[model samples]
Target: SLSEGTFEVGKNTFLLNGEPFVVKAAEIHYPRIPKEYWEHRIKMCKALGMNTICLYVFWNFHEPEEGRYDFAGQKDIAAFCRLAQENGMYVIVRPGPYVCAEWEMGGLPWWLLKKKDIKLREQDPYYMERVKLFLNEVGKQLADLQISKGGNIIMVQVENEYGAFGIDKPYISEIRDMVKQAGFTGVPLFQCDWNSNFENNALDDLLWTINFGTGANIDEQFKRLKELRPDTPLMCSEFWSGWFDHWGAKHETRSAEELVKGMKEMLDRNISFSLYMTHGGTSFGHWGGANFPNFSPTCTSYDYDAPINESGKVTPKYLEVRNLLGNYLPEGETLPEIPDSIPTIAIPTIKMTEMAVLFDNLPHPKESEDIRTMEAFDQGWGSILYRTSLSASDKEQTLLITEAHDWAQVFLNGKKLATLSRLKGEGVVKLPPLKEGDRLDILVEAMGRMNFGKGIYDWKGITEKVELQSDKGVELVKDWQVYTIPVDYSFARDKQYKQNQPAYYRSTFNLNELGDTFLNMMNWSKGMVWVNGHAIGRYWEIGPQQTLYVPGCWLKKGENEIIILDMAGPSKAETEGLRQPILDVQRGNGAYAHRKMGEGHHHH
Candidate 1:
């Protein structure tokens, strides 16, 4: 008969079945990597001498809408945990009803914003109601996998880094109790916060852990932590091995020498730790989030300069970390060899043949007397176009998009006038002299919501209103037509479309061989890419990420289709497959150049 295992926090150590155990773990988001490659990545971690895998259950990816839950396909959290257990690894689940993983809205369902009265991550009735549903669904999927049930799950985290957001004790306390009620029993429940915020953030009844990155003073950090809770075990919940990249900044990396030195110091002190990202995969689709106040979006390639690169290839960093981990393994226990690299192939440039313009293929517009935000129209992600007319004025006027959420392009009578971005605090664009009976159009794109800090409550599109400024002061624009351009698969695949303005281009290429390759977007301006129906992520000519990583697992040997929705490029342009990624290349001069010149502030 199988007996349930016990996991408890003891003085200065974690007691597993009443024996001291060190958690050698690595963080991997199941949603970030392809569902088919979960085992391969887990095996890669196992080969590095890691005995545990830490995963964040992204709420938005699973429950895209309120009351609608999906645990199937890529959103399968239970299957991911089972695969980890099958590989001889324990699981540490961080089901953040509010995970700030640089994901869209920090993984909260954007549809939640549809109810303006409801506040997120707080103790509101509407918010808690949905949170309870999410917790119940997650618990149903993972609670049985806990070690107490003869499975591999060892710990469940409460709301993620609450101290950084707010010091609401009652909120976190309620969350803890709700988590227990949802069936996450017998195992420890914990919260992770930065050392600076540990004193105010730590829950009285739950175990607390610290999170820090490379170059941090490990001794001083834990000294402060121990001062607060000397009786509990010490753990660094997120020992960041490397850093994520922003759109315009250079790719961020940490040297193996620097990473391993800090890692060894912690290991030598018998401190338990989890490498924040042993493998940082791509942030597929419009799921990438932006930094606050400045509004800079995260790059699609979440490579993070990890031990395992974005394409699942091993690096010098991997070999160095593997050597360091090998020295700390139990006697006679050997780590497996690093996994083999995926193949790579470069293909000839393929011209886009079929095209569907955005304006020409407009769905029925939702007419409104006044311009409304994306939420007001029940649209979560993507761009929306607002159309209205202006009576002729005798003089030229300054067009002001009174508080554009992120980015916008103004047009007059179907001709492009100027571009505006919230990143640059650009709200005013000088308009050409207007005549009576002229039409005014504004297309606003949600660059991405502010994932961290106070700006998280960011609603999309023209949140306030649009106006025209002149010698006679401001005039409010009204009687607008709002169109939602989600640019989804259905919109891209439709063939019977006509308008030639900013459009969706589709083309097919025949490949005699199949392997991993970067989709070169040098000729193409700003847009998103979908290869063989799988979203490869976004591309911009203003890049620090000029090529999108296309995995071989997503490709086939015969004909492959590529779809692009370029908002500012030629109606049709040629794009090719490359042998290597062009992460830092920028187009010298063009529509992207001006935007690149005004790059936003970036942080790791």
Candidate 2:
């Protein structure tokens, strides 16, 4: 329970009960961290001397389908806030009807695409209609939890970083009114944007905060903030602690010393800040998003090299931030004792007992005259197969997929020809001299859509037509059978399918005791996995995140089941468990390599 008080923004400081307050906060998304481990993660923040835990309310995670909302189990945002309050912490809610946290569709429900003319985060009636319903649902769950209502939530942010998206005052104002109508009142209603877009995105009536990461010009950034709103209290809504890793890219890490220095600078000036992703959990499932221009999908393990690792273990960064926080603690206050690390155990390589071939298990296909994008089929996430027959060119030619949104595996006459990736802007593939009735199948995987910038409206699968060209001329392939492969928990459990071609494999192993472990996906080539019916997210042999974190909570004492749906067959029929995560190891790449963090807010 929280002491009944009003939280307000004063001229130069946050006022709690009309007194100065400096927010010592850490950002953690409830959907990213397992619901079972929410308390553990919250306690970790408390132990780190954090007074507030900022959480992004992932709308898609809760309302995966329009009008159909789920708040049970892992989607329980209210329960997560209750736990945070129980552990004695304030809460900052970022309910982005459009939170660009590298989340699929920026946390907007994909079903909205069904509305062909939908303009998200705007005042468009179709978009706002659903937004109202979503806010109503979220309000029912979290409105009473507001600090004004004797709960822990201190502030509710308006649309996230709207300035980066565009300057839509009517949309921002409407969202602000919707938030208040949904019951987020009394506490400050604020908006967060990068320093560059603050002036354009800032709402005149609402509070404004800036977001930036290490190596940023702090003094200059704050100077700009003060220039725009000199009287408002300063706050860094998202202080990037570390960077997220993209597939095929090396794992990213920032200097702990520099991070501590940044923290000191902020604390020294009484500038409130929320360490963005003090603990970035996994972007489990197909929820991970990609960057624009170069559409590289984010890896499963969001680890983000933060204070808390993906597996909930404390890293050196944790200690560095903790030490810094200790020195700045108010007199008579003390941080809680750090909790024990989660136990880990290695499992012997287990062989898959049965396999379900993709060719055999595909759902009934939707017939089309021309290839279509995932959205055209009303499918938001997952893989799609575009099958057609090549009319046999006079000579060998090149098959060019005008646009493969993310990754595509090209097959002809039932055999894989080559793989194409949107990351490299790869589309052209050599086609051998084809005979009449030769089948041309391209299995396209929606690695994830671009969640930020100009590419926010990115479509998946074959966005445009597939063209076949030779010295003669160009021909557009026509008459297709598009199959939607969601590859969810249900797909892993379906025993009706038989083994033949690229498929899902299932096996059971006995365990005397369960402990945290990593599933070595070294042999697996592009696909997702499920352990004891829990979706562990996607994996690829391309490198980085070679192992998927299998929480002990998802495991059992005996007869634990593992199912893997590999787009390409596994190199080996068996996989081993590692006591530690193999996040940096690149199997195909000869040696370890590292990549610098790219621009984009690290969220989800």
Candidate 3:
């Protein structure tokens, strides 16, 4: 296959230069992996016998703030596509203004929420205004790369998985136009949804496809699509190779044995499919998203228990899947040789003697009579501190935070009190008799906003009124001081250490050599971890995820710096580096196994 080829929709399959083409594709995102490692990761997918590379263009990742755009370095989508072409693979683009791939706000910019009542994924003037602007920018970067224009992009997906979200054809139609208007006019356009409902945003001109996970009757999934649209080619745009894990949930995995039957069915029939995550990469920084009902945040490692694990290393499942895919390869052609595994390193526990007390290092606070969200402060992701003084006192009084967006840690007189999590159904705390001058601080962490469902207009920090209640009824807390936690861990340099209160601990360890290692946070309690200056990921003793993936590429040969903001007081100030990731261990009751009862509403 050459970099330049003609790709078109046929009567029953995709046509590449007028020849029937069966797309054996793997989905990998650009922003998830380090820019330096893009070529290596793409080769891993090709080595798995996939001829096509599928991807979701995360909008929030490209433009975190309004009008400010970035495509350089890690956000470089064009470079990623060019790498795929260099690797001899076709490309598929699922650029969502709302691509819900378990990412924060489904890839929608957080600043959109700044417009108090803005409608998302719809035709709200302000919403479309921004969508048009972003899409236009995308087209400017990618339009020339279409197959018809001597580029490898085979098809551009329209608004992703809209059936599961809603049935707004106009919204879908508007997006279709935006995609075209943005100059993706050369390639065929399509829409994808769960097989249960594939009719949303269906346009006569636009193609339709379905998505389903393991244990799905592969033939049945395709059968429904064929029944719906007989003449068009059928494809599983998102064949869930594995599942994503919420912070407290068990590590998600899908059996290669179970997928064997589904895999064979598709290959035998010449059906097209893209593994939802051929190589589930890391959600570096805080771009990881959350689910709804109870706002359950996704873990930073998007390992997804995929065939290709988070570190880009091939797993046992990868070998099995490769062998099976090899059987169906065209006429005696063998798959590409697998790439060498990335190196791994292990280190002994590094002592963390230096610390910076959070309260002591507090930035000047913004005084407000009423509570505002983190976004209202122009802060996108991270913690927000809300402090207020006690006006009246009663031992019998109950202090209720109407809603703590995700997680909240309460403090009295700068001492740790209780940590309440929205996931664990917590918001109320009993109050002790206090003096009028006593101060109360509630530090709320904005675990990625609700990325899916109708409650996606999720705001962070203290989202509602604070109430102090007794037998005489409730009094709403009025005046308060709010401050946003610096997402950058630059504050960990201070030498003033305060014991027992929530603080940031700093430590440095020398490494003569560098390789990918898992930063073990098993001994440490709840909070975020920063390595060398990068917000590596989040870790909680709440279990499931006990370590964060540290790429060797990000480490240095000399001294390496680590800053941890341990929210629940520091009983343990040190962490070690392990050779493997611990993603399934459950501590306490913060975990629940996946409810795999064939519900399409859960997985998007």
1-604 per-residue lDDT for model 2 (tens digits)? 5457789989899987788999999989887887888999999999998999998888888887667799999998999999998998999998878887888877887777766677767788998988888888889999989888888889999988888788888888899999999988778899988878888867788988889988787787878879777888999888987889888776768889989999899999999999988888898888887877556788988888999989899989999899889988878878799998778999999988787778777789999998778888978878899998877666889988989878889988788889777777788999988888999889998876678876677878898899988888998889999998875688668755443246888888999987899999998888888898888888988778899999888888989999888887877878999998888865553211223233336533
TM-score versus the correct structure, for each prediction: 0.95, 0.95, 0.95
TM-score of 3: 0.95
**Weakest lDDT window of 10 consecutive positions for candidate 1:** 586-595
The C-alpha RMSD of each candidate to the native structure, in angstroms, is 3.0, 3.9, 3.7
- lDDT per prediction? 0.83, 0.85, 0.84
Count of backbone clashes, every candidate in sequence: 3, 0, 0
The true-versus-predicted C-alpha distance at residue 281 of model 2, in Å, is: 1.3
In model 2, which regions exceed 4 Å deviation? 1-3, 470-472, 495-501, 587-604
Candidate 3 — worst ten consecutive residues by lDDT sum?
590-599
Q: Write the per-residue lDDT of candidate 3 for residues 1-604, one digit (tens) a residue.
A: 3255678889988899899999999989887898888999999999998999998999998898788999998889999999998999999998888888888888998999999998887889999989989999999989889998888899999988888877889888889999999999889999888777776567778888889887788767877778877888889888886878887766667788877677788888888999888888888888888887667889888988788899999888899989999888889798899999889999789988787777777887988998888888888888899999986566667889978888898888877677788886578887778878789999998888787877579888888788988778998987989888867656555447644667788878899988999988888888888888877878888768889999898899989988888877656778899999988886875343335222345454
- Please give the range of 10 consecutive residues that has the lowest summed lDDT in model 2: 590-599
Clashing residue pairs in candidate 1 are 392-435, 392-436, 544-583
- Kindly report which residue stretches of model 3 are placed more than 4 angstroms away from their true locations once superposed: 1-4, 392-394, 489-499, 590-604
lDDT by residue for model 1 (1-604), tens: 3469878999989988899899988999887898878888888898888888998888888887677789998898899899998988999999889888788888888888888877778898888888888999999999889999888999999998888887888899888988998899879999999888877767888999999998899887888878777878889999987878776655556789999998899899889999988998898888888888667888888888889888888889988999999999888978887777778999898988877877777878899998778989988888899998788777789887887787788888888888776756778877777887787878888866778876678899999888888888988888988998884776677745332246788888998998889888887767788998888887777777888998888888889998898877652388888988877765433322345545646522
